[PDB]
Amino acid sequence: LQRLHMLQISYFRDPYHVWYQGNASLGGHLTHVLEGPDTNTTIIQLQPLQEPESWARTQSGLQSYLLQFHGLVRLVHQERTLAFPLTIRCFLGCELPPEGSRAHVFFEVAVNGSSFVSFRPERALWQADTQVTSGVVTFTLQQLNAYNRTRYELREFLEDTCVQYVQKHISAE
């Protein structure tokens, strides 16, 4: 519906062993799969939407996102008490409404099936979704809000890159 939605589920049995499963849909059709442990992560386009050189660039940046994501969970563990095993769910995307002056974009993170933090994209700030203050949540937010990587680069990815991908490829669906 002029939208790209991406889902990443990350199963941590311990800080150093993670299992990934995810997928992306474009206009409500499955277009990408994420699969495998950190030791060997498969990231696939089901439909050849990007040309080889282009997709290879996109794929390298996804792998790099994963490495930094994993580093942040180990850091939270390394600095606060983080109880494993745990499952993290990242749900993110962009939507072009027919009646919209702006894309709607989002990035929502849950832990163990409960709301944890989410991204306020235009101001490029992360917020807690948990009702109670927690050293884990507070420390995570401190990390997410302190660096350009998790603020301004992510805003660009959701507002610019995702939206330009929808405009460029929805007609294929």
Ligand X SMILES: *[C@@H]1O[C@H](CO)[C@@H](O[C@@H]2O[C@H](CO)[C@@H](O)[C@H](O)[C@H]2NC(C)=O)[C@H](O)[C@H]1NC(C)=O
Ligand Y SMILES: CCCCCCCCCCCCCCCCCCCC(=O)O[C@H](COC(=O)CCCCCCCCCCCCCC)COP(=O)(O)OCCN
Ligand Z SMILES: *[C@@H]1O[C@H](CO)[C@@H](O)[C@H](O)[C@H]1NC(C)=O
Task: List interacting residues with ligand Y (CB under 6 A).
Answer: 6, 8, 22-24, 32, 34, 43, 58, 61-62, 65, 68-69, 72-73, 76, 88, 90, 92, 109, 111, 140, 149-150, 153-154, 156-157, 161-162, 165
Nearer to ligand Z, 40 or 114 (CB): 40
Residue of 40, 101, 131, 133 that binds ligand Z (CB under 6 A): 40
Examine residue 85 and say whether the peptide bond preceding it is cis (omega within 30 degrees of 0): yes
3 state SS of 143: helix
CB contact at 8 A, 105 and 162: yes
Cα(138)–Cα(108) distance, integer angstroms:
16
Instruction: State both tokens at 27.
Output: 């206009």
Instruction: State both tokens at 132.
Output: 């109670």
Q: Which listed option, ligand X, ligand Y, ligand Z, none, makes contact with residue 65 (CB within 5 to 8 Å by class)?
A: ligand Y
Binding site for ligand Z (CB under 6 A): 36, 40, 42
